Design a protein around this ligand. Structure first.
Ligand code: C0L
Ligand code: ZN
Lengths: 393, 98, 197, 302, 108, 50, 99
DNA sequence: GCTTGACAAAAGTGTTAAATTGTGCTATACT
DNA sequence: AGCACAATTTAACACTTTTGTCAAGC
């Protein structure tokens, strides 16, 4: 608990801590929230807000006193936030009181209103590229599949159909051919068979692709995705890229990207970032998938070391991550700041121009509300059963 | 922490019923397992008494209490309350009932 | 299939005309009580706002008809009304049921059904009767078969009516109230008459 | 979707413009004065000629048609306004309906000769009726509208002084702020205190309703009832322990026989004696009754 | 934890004297749809002919008294909302306006 | 430091109860006993059972 | 066939309720979506607690308070407009609504 | 046994005032 | 939102008669 908490802090304790084993960028969860939130800008792009320095203030009272007088042991929050108008460009830097923020005990617990709770760490299999071939016994054929479930994202399937075909159902759609993706991805049938020569179901489906030209695939995708909608040509790239590459509404975690590259040896020697996807990723995906439903042992993608050809497990720890305490806290922080920014941008225009200050722009009420409703009102924020030191631990 | 019994205490607000929960008095719920059971035994009067004069009979409760205080034969079990409640409900569901 | 219901009505002296509803009943308020707790912010019973919606829509569309309005909004309000009625009877059956604060669904009259077993026979869980006592159990190896141990403190509370009666029979408590407070006092002869009772 | 269904319904008609307003209003004016002169001849005024009848009724019908027409055209604006008030208290379609009603009222009381846009004069009645019905039917406990306004000012000033003070201000500060008394503020808040449901589970394991923990403090003690009974019993015994006119006077003075206590007036009436004779009576009676001899059994019932 | 309540009414407890009651009057009111509702009123009690009955509509007495039927007018008419804000002469102007309008319409 | 037992009084608290017509009987007991009304209701703290 | 429900129950027939039987049941039609005063804290006329339809919440106590004796019953204060009686028929009576 | 005259407190009585509350009203344009 | 006004409610208070009280003697 100490370490999750301090990292979320980003305390210099943790600073040297993570630095002990590489960790070129020691970043606290709050720092992450800043970088993932800043800047703050109007849709017109006329004006710009930003944050900096999530800095903790000392606690408002001692732990004994906080417990006794029933004041939840917390501490203030100051942020070097800054606004600038994109139209002309002028700094609006404030050190904003983000709110009083609870502080972990030295026994790793928390006191809410004098009450003493315990947060729990919750087990979850991480988001990742997940493989399986349930044999259609009625067909007596292994049905290799994949469901790459990202955070804050959409689903997708590369399925080994009963036919020698592609199970390219994506985002809960019901079915696709890979060719529609490739030409939609800017790939000719030439480019596909070039990239996929040993790809038998690929060549078969490309014979049964029954559609030619990129934009044909783009419009078919668009209509089947928004059925009950007029197809438009610019939405070809201006929807999918938003769906799966515009990393503002489709973003598996950084650890997700890490798991991806590590499973695939794609981003071999660089730190993890850019939760948006790449056609590189999808094509290596398809290659490994087909080879898995091909008879294989390991395949080295161009730029990637060969990954041993095999399935995946939801049960095995290698997928089953662990959302920690600071993890859940950052989740709440993100959900609060979402609402707060979507009201800042609201006022962002309605606020008077060249007369506002981020102080005029700021509302910490929803965030503090979320904080309170998390510490209280949560089956993960539970009462420390202190019947003895043992069971307490 | 576990020992607890009860005869008579604070009746309900929604229903007419003296509060369950060992924090308050509370007590023990004679439900489905040993009903079907009592029927198996064949003894009916005890079950009827339980489900009427210990369950819902508003007047009958104080009646029986009086009778015990006076040392006299038990009154007869009155009509259940939740019964009539369900009846009114079925009525108000636009249902010719009688 | 059709002839089933056809013969049902035919045989019956009933009338399918009643299937449409025109005049709506209402539950007694006591079963939907607006009960109070200590301080002024009282308690309610889930149906009140249903009836409120119904009354509001009815009065609205009434005065609408009174005015004379474009039939479009008339039909709109009527649809709203029928939706309201359906929510009342069993909301969440059709469309999406009706809202409040607190992420949690609705409860029509249909949901107040005690048994209300639909498609699964769950545990039953009735009303939790009176006049018992619970405890952990222990052996009575000295005891006879027909017997049973008993915490004297417990039964002490049990036979309170019996004991009070039998003791006021004795010249030990002038009124019943004397008996009850004496029970609170537990004057050991209380245990004596407890024996006989 | 009834919402989107009505949305498609309402998108079916297109908008209009200035001269639209012009001619439609003038048409409706013509129709109203037409029906006016119609009811003028409704009372005995004339054997109305055929063409005059036909085109006057036509003018009526036409003003009515354009009446519905413009309303239809502006329903889109109705929705465009009402969209921004939901997510709070009252359902959306009802808001729609009441905005429709306010549309009705405004278009009724609209002038073109002021040469404005219809929407401008509309918006007043629009948001008026909207917020009106908002305060009307957003609480299962109805509240006066001025009460609503003062509550709204209260909450406004509250968020204000929150972000200003940085914390929740003091109630005394607030009462100081809106220039009323603190207890007044308290009463306002309480009236502005919404009820809670009894259909949630207090336990995190959800099996017991919240209403399954409410002690009925106005329920029956019952044993108290039989206590009251035996009270009466020993009572009547003691009443018979003394003379007749005594107990008669007592029951009459306490309503012990009728539930209605009589005065010395009624008592000396029925007995034919003076009040003060009755007062002598009562004096000796309560003397006699106030004996430990008599009250030994009786004291217990307190 | 204890949580008590109380319905906002008083509950006394007398004995049910079926023999001794306040004597009382009985009335018959008629409705619009000729319904007859009958209410035991006190002996010392005025019998107001008007009464909204169990029907739920208003019901008058069995007898004929007729103190005042309505003594009240409608609230407004959109006629009136125009009349207050527009002249009778304006009215006649638009009237003959539309007269010639429909004329130079179909009948030119 | 005082010993206690279930049902005993914990804290002497009281509030007004309001006003209702007394029973004639209770009124009689007050009269014979010279006992006031004290409409404030007795709402104290007693230790629960056991 | 006895709504008072005293000890004698041969059969229990169910059926679809006629609108008449509905309107035959209720003692009045509520016509105000109102519950209780915020301030005096009492029911409202034509509201969902109107004792005029439902009955008194207070044993033998007319709304205006013109009577509070059980000797008064089977009667109604024309001013209060509710029948002095026991205070549990509210548990029984039903209200109706004409659409 | 009991009544008398007188006596003040109290229950109404009624008017007036204050407060309370339902209702209506607003005119750049904005679908 | 806020103001205007309007009916509606109630409470406040000034006065009156009524009832309980006394002290009296008879
Ligand atoms: C008026 C009836 C209309 C039809 C019935 C309906 C809609 C009910 O939905 C099903 C019947 C039912 C359940 C009603 C529950 C009520 C009234 C209530 O509140 C309870 C209750 O919840 C539990 C009990 C008993 C403890 C149930 C014992 C069952 C024994 N069965 C048996 O002996 O095996 C043959 O009594 C009640 O009055
Ligand atoms: Zn009354």
């Amino acid at each position: 608990q100490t370490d999750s908490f301090e990292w979320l802090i980003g305390s210099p304790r943790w600073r040297e801590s993570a630095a002990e084993r590489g960790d070129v960028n020691p970043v606290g969860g709050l720092e992450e929230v800043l970088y993932e939130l800043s800047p703050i800008e109007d849709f017109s792009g006329s004006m710009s807000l930003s944050f900096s320095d999530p800095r903790f203030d000392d606690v408002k009272a001692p732990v004994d006193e906080c417990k006794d007088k029933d004041m939840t042991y917390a501490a203030p929050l100051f942020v070097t936030a800054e606004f600038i108008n994109n139209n002309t460009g002028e700094i609006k830097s404030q050190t904003v009181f983000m709110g009083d923020f609870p502080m972990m005990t030295e026994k790793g617990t928390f006191i809410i209103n004098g009450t003493e709770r315990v947060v729990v760490s919750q087990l979850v299999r991480s988001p990742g590229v997940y493989f399986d071939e349930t044999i259609d016994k009625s067909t007596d054929k292994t049905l290799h599949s994949v469901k790459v479930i990202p955070s804050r994202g959409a689903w997708l399937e590369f399925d080994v159909d009963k036919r020698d075909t592609v199970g390219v159902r994506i985002d809960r759609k019901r079915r696709q051919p890979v060719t529609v993706l490739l030409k939609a991805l800017g790939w000719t049938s030439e480019q596909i068979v070039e990239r996929f020569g040993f790809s038998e179901i690929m060549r078969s489906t490309l014979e049964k692709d029954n559609t030619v030209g990129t934009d044909e695939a783009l419009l078919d995708i668009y209509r089947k995705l928004r059925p009950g909608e007029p197809p438009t040509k610019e939405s070809a790239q201006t929807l999918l890229e938003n769906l799966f590459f515009k990393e503002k509404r489709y973003d598996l975690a950084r650890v997700g990207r890490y798991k991806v590259n590590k499973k695939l040896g794609l981003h071999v020697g660089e730190p993890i970032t850019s939760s948006t996807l790449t056609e590189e990723d999808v094509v290596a995906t398809i290659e490994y998938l087909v080879r898995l439903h091909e008879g294989q042992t390991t395949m080295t993608v161009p730029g990637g070391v060969e990954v041993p050809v095999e399935t995946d497990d939801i049960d095995h720890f290698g997928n089953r991550r662990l959302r920690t305490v600071g993890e859940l806290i950052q989740n709440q922080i993100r959900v609060g700041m979402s609402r707060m920014e979507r009201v800042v941008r609201e006022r962002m225009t309605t606020q008077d121009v060249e007369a506002i200050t981020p102080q005029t722009l700021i509302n910490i009420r929803p965030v503090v509300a979320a904080i309170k409703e998390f510490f209280g009102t949560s089956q993960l924020s539970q009462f420390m059963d202190q019947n003895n030191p043992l069971s307490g631990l | 922490d576990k020992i607890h019994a009860r005869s008579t205490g604070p009746y309900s607000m929604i229903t007419q019923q003296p509060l369950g929960g060992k924090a308050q008095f509370g007590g023990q719920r004679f439900g489905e397992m040993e009903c079907w059971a009592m029927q198996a035994y064949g003894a009916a009067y005890t079950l009827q008494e339980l489900l009427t004069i210990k369950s819902d009979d508003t007047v009958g409760r104080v009646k029986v209490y009086e009778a015990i205080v006076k040392g006299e034969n038990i009154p007869e079990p009155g009509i259940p309350e939740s019964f009539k409640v369900l009846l009114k409900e079925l009525q108000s569901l636009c249902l010719n009932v009688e | 299939k059709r002839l089933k219901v056809v013969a049902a009505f035919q045989q019956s002296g009933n009338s399918p005309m009643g299937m449409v509803l025109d005049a709506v009943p209402v539950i007694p308020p006591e079963l939907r009580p607006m009960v109070q707790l200590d301080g002024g912010r009282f308690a309610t019973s889930d149906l009140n706002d249903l009836y409120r919606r119904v009354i509001n829509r009815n009065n609205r569309l009434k005065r609408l008809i009174d005015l004379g309005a474009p039939e479009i909004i008339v039909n709109n309000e009527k649809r709203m009304l029928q939706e309201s009625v359906d929510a009342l009877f069993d909301n969440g059956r059709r469309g999406r049921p009706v809202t409040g604060p607190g992420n949690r669904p609705l409860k029509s009259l249909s949901d107040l059904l005690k048994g209300k077993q639909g498609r699964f026979r769950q545990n039953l869980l009735g009303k939790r009767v009176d006049y018992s006592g619970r405890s952990v159990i222990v052996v009575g190896p000295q005891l006879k078969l027909h017997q049973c141990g008993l915490p004297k403190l417990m039964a002490l509370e049990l036979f309170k009516p019996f004991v009070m009666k039998r003791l006021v029979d004795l010249n030990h408590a002038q009124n019943i109230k004397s008996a009850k407070r004496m029970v609170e006092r537990q004057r050991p002869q209380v245990w004596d008459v407890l024996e006989e009772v | 979707d009834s919402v989107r269904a009505y949305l498609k319904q309402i998108g079916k008609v297109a908008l209009l413009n200035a001269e639209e307003e012009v001619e439609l209003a003038k048409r409706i004016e013509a129709g109203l004065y037409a029906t006016q002169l119609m009811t003028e001849l409704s009372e005995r005024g004339e054997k109305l000629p055929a063409a005059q009848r036909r085109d006057m009724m036509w003018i009526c019908r036409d003003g009515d048609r354009a009446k519905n027409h413009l309303l239809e055209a502006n329903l889109r604006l109705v929705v465009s306004l009402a969209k921004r008030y939901t997510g709070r208290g009252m359902a959306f379609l009802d808001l729609i309906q009441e905005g429709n009603l306010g549309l009705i009222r405004a278009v009724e009381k609209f002038d073109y000769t002021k040469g404005y846009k219809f929407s401008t004069y509309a918006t007043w009645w629009i948001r008026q009726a909207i917020t009106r019905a908002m305060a009307d039917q957003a609480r299962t406990i109805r509240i006066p509208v001025h009460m609503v306004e003062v509550i709204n000012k209260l909450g406004r000033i509250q968020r204000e002084l929150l972000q200003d003070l940085g914390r929740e201000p003091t109630p005394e500060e607030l009462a100081k702020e809106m220039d009323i008394t603190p207890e007044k503020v308290l009463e306002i808040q309480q009236y502005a205190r919404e009820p809670i449901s009894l259909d949630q589970t207090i336990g995190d394991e959800g099996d017991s309703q919240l209403g399954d923990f409410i002690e009925d403090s106005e329920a029956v003690v019952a044993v108290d009832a039989v206590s009251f009974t035996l009270l009466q019993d020993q009572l009547q015994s003691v009443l018979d322990t003394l003379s007749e006119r005594e107990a008669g006077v007592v029951r009459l003075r306490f309503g012990l026989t009728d539930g209605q206590p009589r005065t010395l007036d009624e008592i000396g009436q029925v007995y034919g004696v003076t009040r003060e004779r009755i007062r002598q009576i009562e004096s000796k009676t309560m003397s006699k009754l106030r004996h430990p001899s008599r009250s030994q059994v009786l004291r217990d019932y307190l | 934890r204890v949580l008590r309540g109380s319905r906002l009414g008083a509950v006394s407890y007398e004995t049910d004297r079926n023999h001794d009651l306040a004597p009382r009057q009985i009335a018959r009111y008629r409705t619009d749809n000729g319904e007859e509702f009958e209410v035991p009123f006190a002996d010392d009690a005025e019998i107001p002919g008007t009464w909204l009955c169990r029907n739920g509509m208003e019901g008058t007495l069995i007898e004929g008294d007729l103190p005042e039927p309505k003594k009240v007018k409608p609230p407004r008419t959109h006629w009136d909302m125009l009349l207050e804000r527009r002249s009778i002469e304006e009215l006649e102007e638009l009237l003959k306006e539309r007269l010639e309008l429909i004329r130079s319409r179909r009948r030119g | 430091g005082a010993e206690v037992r279930d049902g005993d009084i914990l804290v002497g608290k009281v509030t007004p109860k309001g006003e209702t017509e007394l029973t004639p009987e209770e009124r009689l007991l007050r009269a014979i006993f010279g006992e006031k009304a004290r409409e404030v209701r007795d709402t104290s703290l007693k230790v629960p059972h056991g | 066939g006895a709504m008072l429900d005293v000890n004698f129950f041969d059969e229990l027939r169910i059926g679809l309720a006629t609108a008449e039987d509905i309107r035959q049941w209720s003692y009045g039609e509520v016509k105000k979506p109102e519950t209780i005063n915020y301030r005096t804290l009492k029911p409202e006329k034509d509201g969902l607690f109107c004792e005029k339809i439902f009955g008194p919440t207070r044993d033998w106590e007319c709304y205006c308070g013109k009577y509070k004796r059980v000797r008064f019953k089977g009667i109604i204060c024309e001013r209060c407009g509710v029948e002095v009686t026991r205070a549990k028929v509210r548990r029984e009576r039903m209200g109706h609504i004409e659409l």
